[PDB]
Enzyme design. Sequence first.
Site, short mmCIF file in Angstrom:
data_model
loop_
_atom_site.label_atom_id
_atom_site.label_comp_id
_atom_site.label_asym_id
_atom_site.label_seq_id
_atom_site.Cartn_x
_atom_site.Cartn_y
_atom_site.Cartn_z
N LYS A 195 34.49 35.90 29.12
CA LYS A 195 35.43 37.01 28.93
C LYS A 195 35.01 38.29 29.68
CE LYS A 195 37.86 39.92 25.65
NZ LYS A 195 38.42 40.14 24.30
N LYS A 234 35.69 49.63 26.30
CA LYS A 234 34.77 48.85 25.47
C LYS A 234 34.29 47.63 26.22
CE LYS A 234 34.67 45.63 21.56
NZ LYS A 234 35.35 44.80 20.52
N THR A 237 34.74 40.51 20.13
CA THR A 237 34.19 40.73 21.44
C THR A 237 32.98 41.60 21.36
OG1 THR A 237 36.36 40.32 22.49
CG2 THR A 237 34.79 41.63 23.79
#
EC number: 1.1.1.31
Lengths: 290, 291
Positions: B169, B244, B94
Amino acid sequence: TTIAFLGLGNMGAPMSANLVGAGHVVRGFDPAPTAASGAAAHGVAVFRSAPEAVAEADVVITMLPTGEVVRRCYTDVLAAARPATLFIDSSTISVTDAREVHALAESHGMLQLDAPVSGGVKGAAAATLAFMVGGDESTLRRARPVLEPMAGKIIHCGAAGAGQAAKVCNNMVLAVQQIAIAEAFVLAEKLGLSAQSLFDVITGATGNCWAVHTNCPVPGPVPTSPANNDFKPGFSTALMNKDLGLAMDAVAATGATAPLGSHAADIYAKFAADHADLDFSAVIHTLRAR
Amino acid sequence: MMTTIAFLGLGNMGAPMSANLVGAGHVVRGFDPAPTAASGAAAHGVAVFRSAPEAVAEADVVITMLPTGEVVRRCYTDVLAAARPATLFIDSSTISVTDAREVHALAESHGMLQLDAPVSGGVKGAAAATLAFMVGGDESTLRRARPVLEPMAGKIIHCGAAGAGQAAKVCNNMVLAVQQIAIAEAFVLAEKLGLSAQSLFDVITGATGNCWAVHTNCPVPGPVPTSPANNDFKPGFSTALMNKDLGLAMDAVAATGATAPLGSHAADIYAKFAADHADLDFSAVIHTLRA
Ligand SMILES: C[C@@H](CCC(=O)O)C(=O)O
Ligand SMILES: C[C@@H](CCC(=O)O)C(=O)O
Protein backbone atom coordinates in the site's frame (compact mmCIF):
# COMPACT_ATOMS: atom_id res chain seq x y z
CA THR A 1 2.86 15.05 -53.76
CA THR A 2 6.55 16.18 -53.84
CA ILE A 3 8.09 16.37 -50.38
CA ALA A 4 11.44 17.87 -49.37
CA PHE A 5 12.79 16.09 -46.30
CA LEU A 6 15.46 18.14 -44.49
CA GLY A 7 17.21 16.01 -41.99
CA LEU A 8 17.73 12.36 -42.87
CA GLY A 9 19.09 11.15 -39.51
CA ASN A 10 17.99 8.17 -37.42
CA MET A 11 14.38 9.36 -37.46
CA GLY A 12 14.32 11.21 -40.79
CA ALA A 13 15.70 8.41 -42.89
CA PRO A 14 13.03 5.78 -41.96
CA MET A 15 10.31 8.41 -42.13
CA SER A 16 11.33 9.44 -45.57
CA ALA A 17 11.48 5.79 -46.74
CA ASN A 18 7.85 5.37 -45.59
CA LEU A 19 6.86 8.40 -47.68
CA VAL A 20 8.64 6.87 -50.70
CA GLY A 21 6.77 3.70 -50.03
CA ALA A 22 3.43 5.52 -50.04
CA GLY A 23 3.91 6.94 -53.49
CA HIS A 24 5.41 10.39 -52.80
CA VAL A 25 8.26 11.95 -54.68
CA VAL A 26 10.83 12.66 -51.92
CA ARG A 27 13.70 15.12 -52.23
CA GLY A 28 16.19 15.29 -49.41
CA PHE A 29 19.09 17.03 -47.72
CA ASP A 30 21.40 16.07 -44.89
CA PRO A 31 24.87 17.37 -43.99
CA ALA A 32 26.11 13.78 -43.27
CA PRO A 33 27.04 11.80 -46.38
CA THR A 34 26.22 8.47 -44.79
CA ALA A 35 22.70 9.69 -43.88
CA ALA A 36 22.21 11.11 -47.37
CA SER A 37 23.53 7.91 -49.09
CA GLY A 38 21.34 5.65 -47.04
CA ALA A 39 18.33 7.80 -47.87
CA ALA A 40 19.21 7.84 -51.59
CA ALA A 41 19.31 4.04 -51.40
CA HIS A 42 15.64 3.96 -50.49
CA GLY A 43 14.60 6.39 -53.21
CA VAL A 44 15.08 9.91 -51.95
CA ALA A 45 16.61 12.26 -54.48
CA VAL A 46 19.31 13.97 -52.35
CA PHE A 47 20.56 17.48 -53.09
CA ARG A 48 23.72 19.19 -51.96
CA SER A 49 21.88 22.03 -50.27
CA ALA A 50 18.51 22.43 -48.63
CA PRO A 51 17.26 25.26 -50.85
CA GLU A 52 17.74 22.96 -53.83
CA ALA A 53 15.70 20.20 -52.20
CA VAL A 54 12.91 22.60 -51.39
CA ALA A 55 12.65 24.12 -54.95
CA GLU A 56 10.02 21.80 -56.44
CA ALA A 57 8.34 20.66 -53.17
CA ASP A 58 4.67 20.90 -52.20
CA VAL A 59 5.54 19.99 -48.55
CA VAL A 60 8.76 20.58 -46.64
CA ILE A 61 9.45 18.45 -43.60
CA THR A 62 12.24 19.23 -41.13
CA MET A 63 13.68 16.74 -38.70
CA LEU A 64 16.54 18.60 -37.08
CA PRO A 65 18.35 18.66 -33.71
CA THR A 66 17.70 22.16 -32.29
CA GLY A 67 15.49 25.27 -32.66
CA GLU A 68 18.50 27.16 -33.85
CA VAL A 69 19.11 24.74 -36.69
CA VAL A 70 15.42 24.68 -37.57
CA ARG A 71 15.30 28.55 -37.67
CA ARG A 72 18.45 28.71 -39.84
CA CYS A 73 17.03 26.06 -42.18
CA TYR A 74 13.81 28.07 -42.57
CA THR A 75 15.66 31.34 -43.35
CA ASP A 76 17.92 29.40 -45.73
CA VAL A 77 14.99 27.84 -47.69
CA LEU A 78 11.92 29.99 -47.41
CA ALA A 79 12.72 32.22 -50.40
CA ALA A 80 13.33 29.06 -52.48
CA ALA A 81 9.92 27.52 -51.70
CA ARG A 82 6.87 27.96 -53.86
CA PRO A 83 3.92 29.93 -52.51
CA ALA A 84 1.61 28.16 -50.13
CA THR A 85 4.08 25.30 -49.65
CA LEU A 86 3.22 23.33 -46.51
CA PHE A 87 6.01 23.22 -43.96
CA ILE A 88 5.90 20.60 -41.25
CA ASP A 89 8.51 20.75 -38.48
CA SER A 90 8.73 17.35 -36.80
CA SER A 91 11.86 18.26 -34.79
CA THR A 92 11.45 18.46 -30.95
CA ILE A 93 12.29 22.06 -30.10
CA SER A 94 11.10 24.60 -27.61
CA VAL A 95 7.60 26.02 -27.78
CA THR A 96 9.11 29.53 -28.21
CA ASP A 97 11.26 28.36 -31.13
CA ALA A 98 8.32 26.57 -32.69
CA ARG A 99 6.12 29.65 -32.57
CA GLU A 100 8.87 31.79 -33.97
CA VAL A 101 9.46 29.55 -36.97
CA HIS A 102 5.74 29.11 -37.53
CA ALA A 103 5.31 32.90 -37.76
CA LEU A 104 8.32 33.17 -40.06
CA ALA A 105 6.99 30.60 -42.46
CA GLU A 106 3.52 32.08 -42.50
CA SER A 107 4.91 35.63 -43.17
CA HIS A 108 6.18 34.07 -46.43
CA GLY A 109 2.71 32.84 -47.38
CA MET A 110 3.53 29.31 -46.41
CA LEU A 111 1.35 27.06 -44.26
CA GLN A 112 3.12 25.61 -41.20
CA LEU A 113 2.69 23.03 -38.51
CA ASP A 114 4.70 21.81 -35.56
CA ALA A 115 4.39 18.01 -35.50
CA PRO A 116 6.95 16.49 -33.20
CA VAL A 117 6.82 12.78 -32.75
CA SER A 118 6.97 10.04 -30.10
CA GLY A 119 7.92 6.43 -30.86
CA GLY A 120 11.66 6.66 -31.64
CA VAL A 121 13.55 4.95 -34.47
CA LYS A 122 11.48 1.80 -33.98
CA GLY A 123 8.28 3.64 -34.46
CA ALA A 124 9.73 5.64 -37.31
CA ALA A 125 10.65 2.44 -39.13
CA ALA A 126 7.37 0.68 -38.33
CA ALA A 127 5.31 3.82 -39.37
CA THR A 128 3.67 3.94 -35.90
CA LEU A 129 4.85 7.35 -34.75
CA ALA A 130 2.57 9.57 -32.74
CA PHE A 131 2.42 13.09 -34.21
CA MET A 132 1.29 15.85 -31.81
CA VAL A 133 0.32 18.81 -33.97
CA GLY A 134 0.13 22.49 -33.44
CA GLY A 135 -1.44 24.78 -36.04
CA ASP A 136 -4.59 25.39 -38.03
CA GLU A 137 -7.11 22.53 -38.38
CA SER A 138 -7.49 23.11 -42.11
CA THR A 139 -3.67 22.96 -42.56
CA LEU A 140 -3.60 19.69 -40.62
CA ARG A 141 -6.35 18.43 -42.92
CA ARG A 142 -4.16 19.23 -45.90
CA ALA A 143 -1.12 17.52 -44.28
CA ARG A 144 -2.96 14.43 -43.21
CA PRO A 145 -2.23 12.24 -46.28
CA VAL A 146 1.47 12.99 -45.84
CA LEU A 147 1.49 12.20 -42.17
CA GLU A 148 -0.60 9.04 -42.39
CA PRO A 149 2.08 6.84 -43.96
CA MET A 150 4.50 7.74 -41.15
CA ALA A 151 2.07 7.58 -38.34
CA GLY A 152 0.14 5.40 -35.89
CA LYS A 153 -1.50 8.45 -34.38
CA ILE A 154 -2.05 12.08 -35.35
CA ILE A 155 -3.39 14.41 -32.62
CA HIS A 156 -4.31 18.06 -33.05
CA CYS A 157 -3.14 19.78 -29.83
CA GLY A 158 -4.14 23.33 -30.65
CA ALA A 159 -2.59 26.45 -32.28
CA ALA A 160 1.07 26.69 -33.37
CA GLY A 161 3.41 25.40 -30.66
CA ALA A 162 0.78 23.19 -28.96
CA GLY A 163 2.32 20.03 -30.36
CA GLN A 164 5.67 20.83 -28.78
CA ALA A 165 3.95 21.85 -25.54
CA ALA A 166 1.88 18.65 -25.36
CA LYS A 167 4.91 16.43 -25.94
CA VAL A 168 7.15 18.23 -23.46
CA CYS A 169 4.42 18.13 -20.78
CA ASN A 170 3.77 14.42 -21.31
CA ASN A 171 7.46 13.61 -21.26
CA MET A 172 8.13 15.59 -18.05
CA VAL A 173 5.35 13.53 -16.35
CA LEU A 174 6.83 10.31 -17.82
CA ALA A 175 10.31 11.05 -16.38
CA VAL A 176 8.85 11.72 -12.96
CA GLN A 177 6.83 8.51 -13.19
CA GLN A 178 9.87 6.45 -14.27
CA ILE A 179 11.82 7.63 -11.29
CA ALA A 180 8.92 7.25 -8.88
CA ILE A 181 8.39 3.66 -9.99
CA ALA A 182 12.06 2.95 -9.56
CA GLU A 183 11.95 4.34 -6.00
CA ALA A 184 8.95 2.15 -5.27
CA PHE A 185 10.63 -1.07 -6.47
CA VAL A 186 13.80 -0.37 -4.43
CA LEU A 187 11.77 0.53 -1.30
CA ALA A 188 9.73 -2.68 -1.72
CA GLU A 189 12.84 -4.79 -2.01
CA LYS A 190 14.33 -3.32 1.18
CA LEU A 191 10.99 -3.90 2.98
CA GLY A 192 11.01 -7.53 1.89
CA LEU A 193 8.15 -7.19 -0.64
CA SER A 194 8.95 -9.14 -3.80
CA ALA A 195 9.12 -7.34 -7.20
CA GLN A 196 6.38 -9.52 -8.62
CA SER A 197 4.11 -8.74 -5.61
CA LEU A 198 4.66 -5.00 -5.94
CA PHE A 199 4.11 -5.20 -9.69
CA ASP A 200 0.79 -7.12 -9.21
CA VAL A 201 -0.40 -4.51 -6.73
CA ILE A 202 0.60 -1.29 -8.47
CA THR A 203 -0.67 -2.43 -11.87
CA GLY A 204 -4.04 -3.22 -10.29
CA ALA A 205 -4.11 0.04 -8.30
CA THR A 206 -3.98 3.84 -8.56
CA GLY A 207 -0.21 3.91 -9.14
CA ASN A 208 -0.31 2.05 -12.46
CA CYS A 209 1.35 3.68 -15.48
CA TRP A 210 3.35 2.72 -18.55
CA ALA A 211 6.60 3.16 -16.61
CA VAL A 212 5.68 0.04 -14.68
CA HIS A 213 3.24 -1.96 -16.84
CA THR A 214 5.50 -1.76 -19.88
CA ASN A 215 8.83 -0.31 -18.77
CA CYS A 216 9.14 -2.21 -15.41
CA PRO A 217 12.70 -1.35 -14.23
CA VAL A 218 13.29 -4.70 -12.49
CA PRO A 219 13.76 -7.94 -14.45
CA GLY A 220 10.95 -10.60 -14.46
CA PRO A 221 7.51 -9.04 -14.22
CA VAL A 222 7.51 -7.70 -17.81
CA PRO A 223 9.84 -9.95 -19.88
CA THR A 224 10.17 -7.46 -22.77
CA SER A 225 11.10 -4.45 -20.55
CA PRO A 226 14.66 -3.00 -20.93
CA ALA A 227 15.63 -4.24 -17.44
CA ASN A 228 15.65 -7.85 -18.87
CA ASN A 229 17.95 -6.85 -21.75
CA ASP A 230 20.79 -4.90 -20.07
CA PHE A 231 18.75 -1.65 -20.29
CA LYS A 232 19.07 -1.47 -24.05
CA PRO A 233 16.83 1.33 -25.33
CA GLY A 234 13.83 1.54 -25.63
CA PHE A 235 13.97 5.23 -24.88
CA SER A 236 17.47 6.41 -24.08
CA THR A 237 18.52 8.49 -21.12
CA ALA A 238 20.21 10.80 -23.64
CA LEU A 239 16.84 11.51 -25.39
CA MET A 240 14.94 11.78 -22.14
CA ASN A 241 17.51 14.23 -20.86
CA LYS A 242 17.04 16.23 -24.06
CA ASP A 243 13.26 16.44 -23.56
CA LEU A 244 13.65 17.42 -19.94
CA GLY A 245 16.07 20.21 -20.93
CA LEU A 246 13.24 21.54 -23.17
CA ALA A 247 10.80 21.19 -20.30
CA MET A 248 13.16 23.25 -18.11
CA ASP A 249 13.32 25.90 -20.86
CA ALA A 250 9.57 26.05 -20.97
CA VAL A 251 9.42 26.28 -17.13
CA ALA A 252 11.99 29.17 -17.17
CA ALA A 253 10.27 30.96 -20.08
CA THR A 254 6.87 30.89 -18.28
CA GLY A 255 7.91 31.26 -14.66
CA ALA A 256 6.10 27.97 -13.93
CA THR A 257 6.49 26.11 -10.63
CA ALA A 258 7.41 22.54 -11.42
CA PRO A 259 9.25 21.09 -8.40
CA LEU A 260 9.10 17.42 -9.25
CA GLY A 261 9.66 17.79 -13.00
CA SER A 262 12.68 20.01 -12.26
CA HIS A 263 13.98 17.47 -9.76
CA ALA A 264 13.54 14.74 -12.33
CA ALA A 265 15.40 16.88 -14.78
CA ASP A 266 18.35 17.24 -12.37
CA ILE A 267 18.34 13.49 -11.81
CA TYR A 268 18.40 12.60 -15.51
CA ALA A 269 21.02 15.28 -16.36
CA LYS A 270 23.35 13.75 -13.87
CA PHE A 271 22.52 10.22 -14.92
CA ALA A 272 23.12 11.14 -18.62
CA ALA A 273 26.82 12.08 -17.73
CA ASP A 274 27.33 8.37 -17.07
CA HIS A 275 24.68 6.28 -18.79
CA ALA A 276 23.32 8.27 -21.72
CA ASP A 277 23.11 5.07 -23.81
CA LEU A 278 20.93 3.10 -21.45
CA ASP A 279 17.19 3.13 -21.37
CA PHE A 280 15.88 5.82 -19.01
CA SER A 281 14.38 3.15 -16.72
CA ALA A 282 17.99 2.40 -15.72
CA VAL A 283 17.69 5.36 -13.33
CA ILE A 284 16.70 2.76 -10.73
CA HIS A 285 20.48 2.13 -10.35
CA THR A 286 21.51 5.73 -9.78
CA LEU A 287 19.38 6.58 -6.77
CA ARG A 288 22.23 5.99 -4.30
CA ALA A 289 24.12 8.76 -6.01
CA ARG A 290 21.09 10.93 -4.85
CA MET B 1 -19.17 -19.58 6.72
CA MET B 2 -21.05 -17.54 9.36
CA THR B 3 -18.57 -16.54 12.04
CA THR B 4 -18.49 -14.35 15.13
CA ILE B 5 -16.34 -11.28 14.44
CA ALA B 6 -15.21 -8.64 16.92
CA PHE B 7 -14.81 -5.28 15.21
CA LEU B 8 -12.61 -2.79 17.07
CA GLY B 9 -12.77 0.65 15.49
CA LEU B 10 -16.21 1.66 14.16
CA GLY B 11 -15.34 4.98 12.56
CA ASN B 12 -15.76 6.19 8.95
CA MET B 13 -14.36 3.00 7.57
CA GLY B 14 -15.13 0.45 10.35
CA ALA B 15 -18.83 1.33 10.54
CA PRO B 16 -19.72 0.60 6.89
CA MET B 17 -17.28 -2.40 6.94
CA SER B 18 -19.07 -3.92 9.94
CA ALA B 19 -22.47 -3.22 8.35
CA ASN B 20 -21.54 -5.38 5.39
CA LEU B 21 -20.41 -8.20 7.68
CA VAL B 22 -23.83 -7.97 9.47
CA GLY B 23 -25.54 -8.12 6.05
CA ALA B 24 -23.61 -11.24 5.13
CA GLY B 25 -25.02 -13.04 8.20
CA HIS B 26 -22.04 -12.74 10.64
CA VAL B 27 -22.51 -11.99 14.25
CA VAL B 28 -20.55 -8.75 14.80
CA ARG B 29 -19.40 -7.70 18.28
CA GLY B 30 -18.08 -4.16 18.20
CA PHE B 31 -16.23 -1.66 20.29
CA ASP B 32 -15.11 1.89 19.71
CA PRO B 33 -14.06 4.44 22.46
CA ALA B 34 -16.17 7.08 20.77
CA PRO B 35 -19.78 6.26 21.70
CA THR B 36 -21.09 8.19 18.67
CA ALA B 37 -19.27 5.77 16.37
CA ALA B 38 -20.44 2.75 18.36
CA SER B 39 -24.08 4.04 18.22
CA GLY B 40 -24.13 4.30 14.45
CA ALA B 41 -22.69 0.80 14.19
CA ALA B 42 -25.29 -0.59 16.57
CA ALA B 43 -28.07 0.91 14.42
CA HIS B 44 -26.91 -1.35 11.56
CA GLY B 45 -26.84 -4.51 13.68
CA VAL B 46 -23.45 -4.58 15.47
CA ALA B 47 -23.75 -5.72 19.08
CA VAL B 48 -21.72 -3.10 20.89
CA PHE B 49 -19.75 -3.74 24.06
CA ARG B 50 -18.55 -1.64 27.01
CA SER B 51 -14.90 -2.64 26.39
CA ALA B 52 -12.59 -4.06 23.74
CA PRO B 53 -11.79 -7.12 25.87
CA GLU B 54 -15.41 -7.97 26.29
CA ALA B 55 -16.03 -7.68 22.52
CA VAL B 56 -13.17 -10.07 21.72
CA ALA B 57 -13.98 -12.65 24.41
CA GLU B 58 -16.33 -14.71 22.26
CA ALA B 59 -15.00 -13.99 18.76
CA ASP B 60 -13.54 -16.33 16.15
CA VAL B 61 -12.06 -13.32 14.29
CA VAL B 62 -10.97 -9.86 15.51
CA ILE B 63 -10.76 -7.03 13.06
CA THR B 64 -9.07 -3.74 13.95
CA MET B 65 -9.64 -0.49 11.98
CA LEU B 66 -7.66 2.07 14.02
CA PRO B 67 -5.89 5.35 13.32
CA THR B 68 -2.28 4.69 14.17
CA GLY B 69 0.30 2.07 14.95
CA GLU B 70 0.41 3.22 18.55
CA VAL B 71 -3.42 2.70 18.94
CA VAL B 72 -3.20 -0.70 17.30
CA ARG B 73 -0.34 -1.69 19.62
CA ARG B 74 -2.21 -0.43 22.69
CA CYS B 75 -5.42 -2.26 21.60
CA TYR B 76 -3.51 -5.56 21.07
CA THR B 77 -1.90 -5.23 24.50
CA ASP B 78 -5.33 -4.66 26.04
CA VAL B 79 -7.16 -7.49 24.23
CA LEU B 80 -4.91 -10.36 23.21
CA ALA B 81 -5.02 -12.15 26.62
CA ALA B 82 -8.85 -11.77 26.51
CA ALA B 83 -9.27 -13.58 23.21
CA ARG B 84 -9.61 -17.33 22.83
CA PRO B 85 -6.49 -19.19 21.76
CA ALA B 86 -5.94 -19.34 18.05
CA THR B 87 -8.33 -16.50 17.29
CA LEU B 88 -7.65 -14.81 13.92
CA PHE B 89 -6.69 -11.12 14.21
CA ILE B 90 -6.86 -9.01 11.07
CA ASP B 91 -5.54 -5.48 11.21
CA SER B 92 -7.04 -3.42 8.37
CA SER B 93 -5.59 -0.15 9.81
CA THR B 94 -2.91 1.65 7.75
CA ILE B 95 0.20 1.74 9.87
CA SER B 96 3.97 1.55 9.45
CA VAL B 97 5.57 -1.59 8.18
CA THR B 98 7.68 -1.66 11.36
CA ASP B 99 4.60 -1.35 13.58
CA ALA B 100 2.77 -4.00 11.58
CA ARG B 101 5.52 -6.48 12.05
CA GLU B 102 5.77 -5.65 15.81
CA VAL B 103 2.02 -6.19 16.39
CA HIS B 104 2.02 -9.32 14.25
CA ALA B 105 4.75 -10.81 16.48
CA LEU B 106 2.84 -9.73 19.54
CA ALA B 107 -0.29 -11.46 18.39
CA GLU B 108 1.53 -14.65 17.55
CA SER B 109 3.38 -14.63 20.90
CA HIS B 110 -0.13 -14.65 22.52
CA GLY B 111 -1.24 -17.67 20.50
CA MET B 112 -3.21 -15.74 17.82
CA LEU B 113 -3.09 -15.90 14.05
CA GLN B 114 -2.57 -12.48 12.53
CA LEU B 115 -2.74 -10.69 9.16
CA ASP B 116 -2.06 -7.14 8.02
CA ALA B 117 -4.79 -6.24 5.58
CA PRO B 118 -4.93 -2.51 4.92
CA VAL B 119 -7.45 -1.24 2.42
CA SER B 120 -7.83 1.13 -0.39
CA GLY B 121 -11.13 2.66 -1.66
CA GLY B 122 -12.10 4.97 1.18
CA VAL B 123 -15.50 5.36 2.74
CA LYS B 124 -17.31 4.85 -0.58
CA GLY B 125 -15.50 1.65 -1.24
CA ALA B 126 -16.21 0.62 2.32
CA ALA B 127 -19.96 1.16 2.00
CA ALA B 128 -20.17 -0.54 -1.39
CA ALA B 129 -18.00 -3.49 -0.36
CA THR B 130 -15.46 -2.75 -3.14
CA LEU B 131 -12.36 -2.18 -0.98
CA ALA B 132 -9.10 -3.67 -2.05
CA PHE B 133 -7.44 -5.65 0.77
CA MET B 134 -3.66 -5.88 0.52
CA VAL B 135 -2.69 -8.76 2.81
CA GLY B 136 0.52 -9.77 4.55
CA GLY B 137 0.83 -13.03 6.45
CA ASP B 138 0.66 -16.78 5.90
CA GLU B 139 -1.21 -18.23 3.02
CA SER B 140 -3.18 -20.61 5.16
CA THR B 141 -4.23 -17.80 7.54
CA LEU B 142 -5.56 -15.83 4.47
CA ARG B 143 -7.47 -18.99 3.38
CA ARG B 144 -9.07 -19.01 6.82
CA ALA B 145 -9.85 -15.29 6.52
CA ARG B 146 -11.25 -15.10 2.97
CA PRO B 147 -14.87 -15.75 3.78
CA VAL B 148 -14.80 -12.84 6.32
CA LEU B 149 -13.00 -10.47 3.89
CA GLU B 150 -15.20 -11.24 0.85
CA PRO B 151 -18.32 -9.42 1.97
CA MET B 152 -16.26 -6.27 2.45
CA ALA B 153 -14.07 -6.54 -0.66
CA GLY B 154 -13.87 -5.96 -4.41
CA LYS B 155 -10.28 -7.36 -4.41
CA ILE B 156 -8.12 -9.47 -2.01
CA ILE B 157 -4.42 -9.62 -2.89
CA HIS B 158 -1.83 -11.57 -1.02
CA CYS B 159 1.32 -9.47 -0.94
CA GLY B 160 3.76 -11.67 1.00
CA ALA B 161 4.73 -12.23 4.70
CA ALA B 162 3.58 -10.12 7.63
CA GLY B 163 4.00 -6.44 6.83
CA ALA B 164 3.77 -6.89 3.02
CA GLY B 165 0.26 -5.54 2.82
CA GLN B 166 1.24 -2.33 4.52
CA ALA B 167 4.43 -2.26 2.34
CA ALA B 168 2.52 -2.71 -0.94
CA LYS B 169 0.00 0.00 0.00
CA VAL B 170 2.58 2.53 1.12
CA CYS B 171 4.68 1.99 -2.05
CA ASN B 172 1.61 2.44 -4.32
CA ASN B 173 0.46 5.55 -2.50
CA MET B 174 3.91 7.21 -2.52
CA VAL B 175 3.87 6.70 -6.30
CA LEU B 176 0.33 8.16 -6.41
CA ALA B 177 1.35 11.26 -4.52
CA VAL B 178 4.29 11.90 -6.87
CA GLN B 179 2.01 11.37 -9.93
CA GLN B 180 -0.67 13.67 -8.54
CA ILE B 181 1.83 16.51 -8.12
CA ALA B 182 3.45 15.83 -11.51
CA ILE B 183 0.08 15.88 -13.32
CA ALA B 184 -0.71 19.12 -11.53
CA GLU B 185 2.63 20.62 -12.70
CA ALA B 186 1.97 19.52 -16.31
CA PHE B 187 -1.51 21.16 -16.33
CA VAL B 188 -0.28 24.50 -14.94
CA LEU B 189 2.69 24.47 -17.36
CA ALA B 190 0.27 23.76 -20.22
CA GLU B 191 -1.81 26.71 -19.13
CA LYS B 192 1.15 29.05 -19.12
CA LEU B 193 2.21 27.75 -22.52
CA GLY B 194 -1.32 28.31 -23.94
CA LEU B 195 -2.04 24.60 -24.36
CA SER B 196 -5.76 23.89 -23.34
CA ALA B 197 -6.52 21.66 -20.40
CA GLN B 198 -8.69 19.52 -22.61
CA SER B 199 -5.91 19.10 -25.18
CA LEU B 200 -3.29 18.20 -22.59
CA PHE B 201 -5.78 15.73 -21.04
CA ASP B 202 -6.40 14.10 -24.41
CA VAL B 203 -2.70 13.81 -25.03
CA ILE B 204 -1.43 12.46 -21.75
CA THR B 205 -4.32 10.02 -21.40
CA GLY B 206 -3.57 8.63 -24.86
CA ALA B 207 0.22 8.62 -24.25
CA THR B 208 2.85 7.16 -21.86
CA GLY B 209 2.07 9.57 -19.07
CA ASN B 210 -1.47 8.30 -18.46
CA CYS B 211 -2.42 7.42 -14.86
CA TRP B 212 -5.29 7.61 -12.39
CA ALA B 213 -4.22 11.03 -11.15
CA VAL B 214 -5.17 12.34 -14.58
CA HIS B 215 -7.75 9.97 -16.01
CA THR B 216 -9.85 9.78 -12.87
CA ASN B 217 -8.52 12.59 -10.59
CA CYS B 218 -7.90 15.28 -13.26
CA PRO B 219 -6.97 18.38 -11.17
CA VAL B 220 -8.51 20.96 -13.55
CA PRO B 221 -12.26 21.19 -14.00
CA GLY B 222 -13.78 20.08 -17.25
CA PRO B 223 -12.19 17.06 -18.74
CA VAL B 224 -13.32 14.57 -16.10
CA PRO B 225 -16.66 15.95 -14.75
CA THR B 226 -16.60 13.43 -11.88
CA SER B 227 -13.14 14.45 -10.55
CA PRO B 228 -12.87 16.55 -7.29
CA ALA B 229 -11.71 19.63 -9.24
CA ASN B 230 -15.27 20.00 -10.44
CA ASN B 231 -16.76 19.82 -6.90
CA ASP B 232 -14.63 22.43 -5.10
CA PHE B 233 -12.00 19.77 -4.35
CA LYS B 234 -14.26 17.97 -1.87
CA PRO B 235 -12.60 14.55 -1.07
CA GLY B 236 -12.27 12.08 -2.73
CA PHE B 237 -9.00 11.19 -0.94
CA SER B 238 -8.27 13.98 1.53
CA THR B 239 -4.91 15.72 1.79
CA ALA B 240 -4.93 14.69 5.44
CA LEU B 241 -5.05 11.02 4.58
CA MET B 242 -2.40 11.28 1.79
CA ASN B 243 -0.18 13.19 4.22
CA LYS B 244 -0.60 10.38 6.68
CA ASP B 245 0.36 7.81 4.02
CA LEU B 246 3.39 9.82 2.97
CA GLY B 247 4.50 10.00 6.67
CA LEU B 248 4.31 6.22 6.71
CA ALA B 249 6.29 6.07 3.47
CA MET B 250 9.01 8.34 4.99
CA ASP B 251 8.98 5.98 8.05
CA ALA B 252 9.57 3.07 5.65
CA VAL B 253 12.40 5.02 3.88
CA ALA B 254 14.01 5.91 7.20
CA ALA B 255 13.74 2.32 8.50
CA THR B 256 15.32 0.80 5.38
CA GLY B 257 17.88 3.52 4.44
CA ALA B 258 16.22 3.69 0.99
CA THR B 259 16.71 6.67 -1.23
CA ALA B 260 13.44 8.04 -2.58
CA PRO B 261 14.13 11.57 -3.85
CA LEU B 262 10.80 12.29 -5.50
CA GLY B 263 8.76 10.40 -2.91
CA SER B 264 10.47 12.41 -0.14
CA HIS B 265 9.96 15.64 -2.12
CA ALA B 266 6.35 14.75 -2.53
CA ALA B 267 6.09 14.13 1.25
CA ASP B 268 7.51 17.65 1.92
CA ILE B 269 5.03 19.26 -0.50
CA TYR B 270 2.05 17.39 1.01
CA ALA B 271 3.13 18.08 4.60
CA LYS B 272 3.10 21.85 3.82
CA PHE B 273 -0.17 21.71 1.92
CA ALA B 274 -1.78 19.69 4.76
CA ALA B 275 -1.11 22.52 7.24
CA ASP B 276 -3.85 24.59 5.64
CA HIS B 277 -5.70 22.32 3.23
CA ALA B 278 -6.01 19.07 5.09
CA ASP B 279 -9.69 18.89 4.23
CA LEU B 280 -9.30 19.26 0.43
CA ASP B 281 -8.83 16.39 -1.97
CA PHE B 282 -5.14 15.74 -2.44
CA SER B 283 -5.52 16.83 -6.17
CA ALA B 284 -5.94 20.36 -4.74
CA VAL B 285 -2.14 20.59 -4.45
CA ILE B 286 -2.39 22.18 -7.96
CA HIS B 287 -3.24 25.45 -6.06
CA THR B 288 0.32 25.64 -4.74
CA LEU B 289 1.70 25.89 -8.34
CA ARG B 290 -0.36 28.94 -9.35
CA ALA B 291 0.87 32.38 -8.30
C1 LIG C 1 -4.10 5.29 -38.31
C2 LIG C 1 -3.30 6.64 -38.34
C3 LIG C 1 -2.73 7.12 -39.73
C4 LIG C 1 -2.47 6.03 -40.75
C5 LIG C 1 -1.42 4.87 -40.36
O1 LIG C 1 -1.62 3.71 -39.73
O2 LIG C 1 -0.36 5.17 -40.80
C6 LIG C 1 -4.17 7.76 -37.76
O3 LIG C 1 -5.38 7.83 -38.08
O4 LIG C 1 -3.59 8.57 -37.02
C1 LIG D 1 -13.48 -10.03 -2.43
C2 LIG D 1 -14.26 -11.08 -3.10
C3 LIG D 1 -15.80 -10.76 -3.27
C4 LIG D 1 -16.54 -9.75 -2.30
C5 LIG D 1 -17.40 -8.56 -2.79
O1 LIG D 1 -17.36 -8.51 -4.15
O2 LIG D 1 -18.05 -7.75 -1.79
C6 LIG D 1 -13.28 -11.30 -4.31
O3 LIG D 1 -13.60 -10.84 -5.43
O4 LIG D 1 -12.15 -11.84 -4.04
